Design a protein around this ligand. Structure first.
Ligand code: ATP
Ligand code: ATP
Ligand code: MG
Ligand code: MG
Lengths: 21, 52, 520, 122, 193, 242
């Protein structure tokens, strides 16, 4: 499950960034 | 006449009015004309309207 | 320390890794055999979002060139930045991913124009949505074209009959000027434009082919049900064979709403370039300016007053200047524009409202205070200007229009003196009641356009006192009684001869004496 | 000698010259365009790049299109030959009566005269 | 098309170049060659002025900078990766980003070489039974099978003990903070009891 | 990344020398063969990094004072207002078109000077002090700072002595002392310059009646008006004798 499992990159309040491989 | 950024319609009206009144003369009697129209009317992007 | 100058980076670019990865992935020895994506005529999407895609590549793309994503949705390359291209999206941006390919089409934006466009409910891009098939008898011309010059025009002579009594007498409209209908919400603007369309159906079956008027209605930002009701209405009157319905509604994407009046102007310029007459109504032009504001603010352009860009005057200028009366060397065609600008509670000193008022010749200010006084259409006769004036006014109507303007000018200043009921003057009372006669004369029900000859007879019968004996409250039906009870010969010769002749003004002077008024 | 377009945004075109930039207010001619487009340098951006304002519409500009410097501001045909003609902003005849006779060809950008050379005669 | 995944994710626009560099040099298995080459270029920027003039001066044309970086890196057994990297970073004036692309590359390689650093700061020079007993207590703070190295520093302010500096977490097992938390724990009771 | 992982590259850490040894002999002819496409490096001098709308951002200028008259190599002067970390943002006294990206900027070592003294009495200068009436350069004059400090609390006494303006409403209703900052406010075309010029002509008239210490010498500062209005004021003051 390396691909199609991203991690949270950054969080600004109610706005979450996910970064994928 | 440096018509800056007005409508094209009034520019055409001024050109026809100075054709018929005897200010702008076309043809071979062009040397007796006493007005140079310069038109930068609303159709043109704002560089032309800024430098007309 | 000698290392401090190279401590913090000074980048001349933002997508630096996208230029490095076009030169490091070939440094792998196994990846030299055509293991490179081409960017000479293609393009990869860097960042999608909010209907804006930023595309790396597209080296040979033009500014304003319609590109196509590999998802099927099309887009216009608008910002050509130094390292990428800011591409707007003509549809939903949910179908676009990072890494998708952008195939440019080499074409600046095109819409199908021609005689087969009549009756076709289309978008601001050219696809018909009425479900009657594709466009058949058409040709594909440009959306953004150069306006005609100073040679290419001639003087606005022939009138464009509206059918509304408040505008055909006071604010006359010639075939080839730009007349703005500015007002508030639910004041009668779209209804005045629809009456101007339906009167062309009433008129075109009496004039030859060179004098017919083909309407184009451009619904920008309206509902879909409003355009459905308007298509049902134009089919119920049968005026769809003269009308093109360009419709970028509120569900449609923001560049479609931005390009809808331009697409409609290109679809209506075909009759102007072919000697016919055209009439275009850019309905809700303020919503087009709002859509351009959104499309520019998502494209990182610096905003100005009310967060609009700088060139939003140019946006309406280069749209409205394509409406003109061409000379006889270029066909003698015409295009009469009708922008519609909505104000908010009467602030006419806004940005877009002042820009469109500064562009257009006329203006029809419909006020929400006089709408609820019973005066429908709600035309404020003081602020409305028509800068062709009497040059394109109907003769016969010119004989009474000066009297109408002067008497309503005195009635507009007799106000703030009628609230004292014992204060009789017997001369300001005469003009005070005459203004009420003329004001309640100019009322109309909606979707009921009156021919111009009946308008001239009906206002002749009121400016000369032939309805002065009735009360102030029964002039809405006495008008119809005057229209019906006269001879049908009076309209029949007044439409044909062109003016109220001295060989007619003694006939209908007496025909108003054989009328029955419901009041004495 | 000749530079290329680097960035097109609206009516503003950023032209990148490699060596010997044109001056400010200088007139630039885009070669390859359909309609005769003329750029006027508004400022220098800072990395061997000027930032121009376009006299005609930028619909149809490619990044990399060769732009040649004219070494002067916008030069117009002036004089007795212009009477009765309708000139453009870049000095082109738009009255469709043929080319303009040229007494002299003057650049449109110049100075206010002086304080000394004035007339206080009301 | 098929790039091996980096061991730890990182930041943008200078760490992305290091991520791509580690990916490409891990496809080629030259992961310690290019680290040596980047170290050599760091010290090469330190040595001469005509090379840092290619990264701090804004009046150098890009043509002479590209041709200098190509004609210098033509020879001396340089890797294809470092050559094409310096060509792409000199074409865009990004030579000043070398100093912070190599640090993110070192963090990436330190994640891969499966080796984490530490620093134990002490008051006396450590003896060999102090050291081999220190490694067993400090390994309980790492979180997987790693190669935690143990650096040594000497500071007289501590009165014995040790403080581990992992560069992201700190374990203060010193006595100087033990007596500092002791004297704080008494005075919260004398004011109460 | 941080500074803690970036300071540690100041110590050498290569552990190989197969790059720094060979190219250190190649780099000097490589920068010799492009000697023509360089520009001489500026440390205490100044090179124009960019220019626009009358504002030139000057790289270099390591020792300018904030507010020092810099002088371009085009002959136009400037004034270093803001000093950034890497460049100097100067203003341009006049035509910005004679400044290209790459010009040289020489600092003058002068906080902005204007010629003051008895010899400039009767002259029409521009905003930098240079005369524009054109009757020779200024004689019997000396330079002084434009941004001197205002005098303090001890250095002022009470406003007592009155400044007669010659206007009846000013001297009757709103009387002006001889050390008083008094604003002449209003709309456009209301007669603010009228009250100004009337005050100036009255100080001319009163200066030929008071003995040599109560003589008040006016100074007019025309900012943003026409050249024809300033020429009209010069003809007016010369035909009056002011
Ligand atoms: N001559 C008329 N007589 C009676 N009623 C009229 C007349 N003209 C318009 N109306 C009424 O006034 C209303 C006008 O609405 P209109 O079509 O102007 O909407 P709009 O103002 O263009 O846009 P919005 O819906 O955003 O307000 C209609 O509902 C119509 O019923
Ligand atoms: N006391 C006065 N009596 C008669 N006329 C006067 C008087 N004061 C001013 N005027 C006239 O009013 C006109 C405007 O005066 P003035 O130029 O001082 O206005 P202003 O405020 O300077 O306008 P602007 O600031 O736009 O130049 C002048 O032509 C002047 O002759
Ligand atoms: Mg409506
Ligand atoms: Mg004044």
């Amino acid at each position: 499950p390396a691909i199609d499992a991203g991690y949270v990159s950054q969080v600004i309040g109610p706005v979450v960034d996910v970064r994928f491989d | 006449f440096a018509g800056v950024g007005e409508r094209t319609r009034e520019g055409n009206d001024l050109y026809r009015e100075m054709i018929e009144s005897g200010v702008i003369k076309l043809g071979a009697e062009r040397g007796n004309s006493k007005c140079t129209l310069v038109y930068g009317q609303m159709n043109e992007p704002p560089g032309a309207r800024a430098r007309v | 320390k000698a290392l401090d100058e190279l401590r913090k980076p000074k980048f001349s670019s933002k997508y630096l890794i996208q230029h490095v990865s076009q030169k490091l992935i070939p440094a792998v020895k196994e990846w030299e055999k055509s293991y490179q994506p081409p960017v000479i005529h293609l393009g990869r999407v860097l960042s999608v979002g909010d209907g804006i895609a930023r595309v790396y590549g597209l080296k040979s793309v033009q500014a304003g060139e319609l590109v196509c994503f590999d998802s099927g949705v099309k887009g216009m390359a608008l910002n050509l930045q130094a390292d990428h291209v800011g591409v707007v999206v003509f549809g939903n941006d949910s179908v676009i991913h990072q890494g998708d390919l952008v195939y440019r089409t080499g074409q600046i934006v095109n819409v199908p124009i021609g005689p087969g466009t009549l009756g076709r409910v289309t978008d601001g891009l050219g696809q018909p949505i009425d479900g009657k098939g594709p466009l058949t008898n058409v040709r594909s011309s440009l959306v953004e074209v150069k306006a005609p010059g100073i040679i290419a025009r001639q003087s606005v002579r022939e009138p464009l009959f509206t059918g509304v009594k408040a505008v055909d007498a006071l604010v006359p409209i010639g075939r080839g000027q730009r007349e703005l209908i500015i007002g508030d919400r639910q004041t009668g603007k779209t209804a005045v434009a629809i009456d101007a369309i339906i009167h062309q159906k009433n008129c075109n079956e009496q004039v030859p082919k060179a004098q017919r008027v083909y309407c184009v209605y451009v619904a920008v930002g309206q509902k879909r049900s409003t355009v459905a009701q308007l298509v049902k209405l134009f089919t119920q009157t049968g005026a769809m064979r003269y009308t093109i319905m360009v419709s970028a509604t509120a569900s449609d994407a923001a560049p479609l709403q931005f390009l809808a009046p331009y697409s409609g102007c290109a679809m209506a310029e075909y009759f102007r370039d072919t000697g016919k007459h055209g009439l275009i109504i850019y309905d809700d032009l303020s919503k087009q300016s709002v859509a351009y504001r959104q499309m520019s603010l998502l494209l990182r352009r610096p905003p100005g007053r009310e967060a609009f860009p700088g060139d939003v005057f140019y946006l309406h200028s280069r749209l409205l200047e394509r409406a003109a009366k061409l000379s006889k060397e270029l066909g003698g065609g015409s295009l009469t524009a009708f922008p519609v600008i909505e104000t908010q509670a009467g602030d006419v000193s806004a940005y877009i409202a002042t820009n469109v008022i500064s562009i257009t010749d006329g203006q029809i200010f419909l006020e929400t205070e006089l709408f609820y006084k019973g005066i429908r259409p709600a035309l404020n006769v003081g602020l409305s200007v028509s800068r062709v004036g009497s040059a394109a006014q109907f003769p016969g109507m010119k004989q009474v229009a000066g009297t109408l303007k002067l008497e309503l000018a005195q009635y507009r200043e007799v106000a703030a003196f009628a609230q004292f009921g014992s204060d009789l003057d017997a001369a300001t009372q005469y003009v005070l009641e005459r203004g009420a006669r003329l004001t309640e004369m100019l009322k109309q029900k909606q979707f009921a356009p009156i021919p111009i000859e009946r308008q001239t007879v009906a206002v002749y019968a009121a400016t000369k006192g032939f309805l002065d004996k009735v009360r102030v409250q029964d002039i809405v039906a006495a008008e119809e009684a005057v229209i019906s009870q006269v001879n049908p010969a009076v309209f029949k010769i007044l439409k044909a001869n062109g003016k109220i002749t001295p060989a007619l003004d003694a006939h209908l002077k007496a025909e108003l004496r054989k009328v029955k008024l419901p009041g004495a | 000698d000749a530079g290329y377009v680097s960035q097109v945004i609206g009516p503003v075109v950023d032209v990148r010259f490699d060596g010997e930039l044109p001056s400010i207010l200088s007139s630039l001619e885009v070669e390859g365009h359909s309609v005769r487009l003329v750029l006027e340098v508004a400022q220098h951006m800072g990395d061997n790049t000027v930032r121009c304002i376009a006299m005609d519409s930028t619909d149809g500009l490619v990044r990399g299109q060769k732009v040649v410097d004219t070494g002067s501001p916008i030069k117009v045909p002036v004089g007795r030959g212009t009477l009765g003609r309708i000139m453009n902003v870049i000095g082109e005849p738009v009255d469709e009566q043929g080319p303009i006779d040229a007494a002299d060809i003057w650049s449109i950008h110049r100075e206010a005269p002086e304080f000394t050379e004035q007339s206080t005669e009301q | 098309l098929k790039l091996p995944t980096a061991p730890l994710q990182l930041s943008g626009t200078s760490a992305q170049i290091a991520t791509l560099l580690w990916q490409v040099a891990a496809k080629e298995n030259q992961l310690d060659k290019v680290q040596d080459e980047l170290y050599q270029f760091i010290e090469l920027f330190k040595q001469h002025s005509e090379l840092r003039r290619l990264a701090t001066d804004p009046f150098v044309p890009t043509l002479v900078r590209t041709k200098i970086i190509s004609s210098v890196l033509k020879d001396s057994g340089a890797s294809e990766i470092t050559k094409k990297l310096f060509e792409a970073l000199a074409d865009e004036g990004a030579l000043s980003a070398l100093l912070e692309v190599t640090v993110n590359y070192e963090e990436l390689m330190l994640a891969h070489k499966k080796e984490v650093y530490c620093t134990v700061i002490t008051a006396e020079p450590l003896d060999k039974l102090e050291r081999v007993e220190l490694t067993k207590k400090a390994e309980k703070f790492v979180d997987a099978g790693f190669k935690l190295v143990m650096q040594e520093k000497i500071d007289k302010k501590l009165l014995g003990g040790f403080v581990i500096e992992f560069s992201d977490r700190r374990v203060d097992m010193s006595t100087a903070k033990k007596v500092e938390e002791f004297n704080n724990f008494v005075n919260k009771l004398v004011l109460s009891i | 990344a941080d500074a803690k992982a970036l300071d540690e590259l100041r110590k050498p850490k290569f552990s190989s020398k197969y790059l720094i040894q060979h190219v250190s002999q190649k780099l000097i002819p490589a920068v010799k063969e492009w000697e023509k496409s360089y520009q001489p490096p500026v440390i205490h001098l100044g090179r124009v990094l960019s220019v626009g709308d009358g504002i030139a951002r000057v790289y270099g200028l390591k020792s300018v004072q904030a507010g020092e008259l810099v002088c371009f190599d085009s002959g136009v002067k400037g004034m270093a207002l803001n000093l950034q970390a890497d460049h100097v943002g100067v203003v341009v006294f006049g035509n910005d078109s004679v400044i290209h990206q790459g010009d040289l900027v020489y600092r003058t070592g002068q906080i902005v000077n204007v010629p003051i003294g008895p010899g400039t009495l009767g002259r029409v200068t521009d905003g930098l002090g240079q005369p524009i009436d054109g009757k020779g350069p200024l004689t019997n004059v000396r330079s002084s700072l434009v941004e001197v400090k205002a005098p303090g609390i001890i250095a002022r006494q009470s406003v007592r002595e009155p400044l007669f303006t010659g206007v009846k409403a000013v001297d009757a209703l709103v009387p002006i002392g001889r050390g008083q900052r008094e604003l002449i406010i209003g709309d456009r075309q209301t007669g603010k310059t009228a009250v100004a010029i009337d005050a100036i002509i009255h100080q001319k008239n009163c200066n030929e009646q008071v003995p040599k210490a109560q003589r008040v010498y006016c100074v007019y500062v025309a900012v943003g008006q026409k050249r024809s209005t300033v020429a009209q004021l010069v003809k007016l003051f010369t035909q009056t004798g002011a």
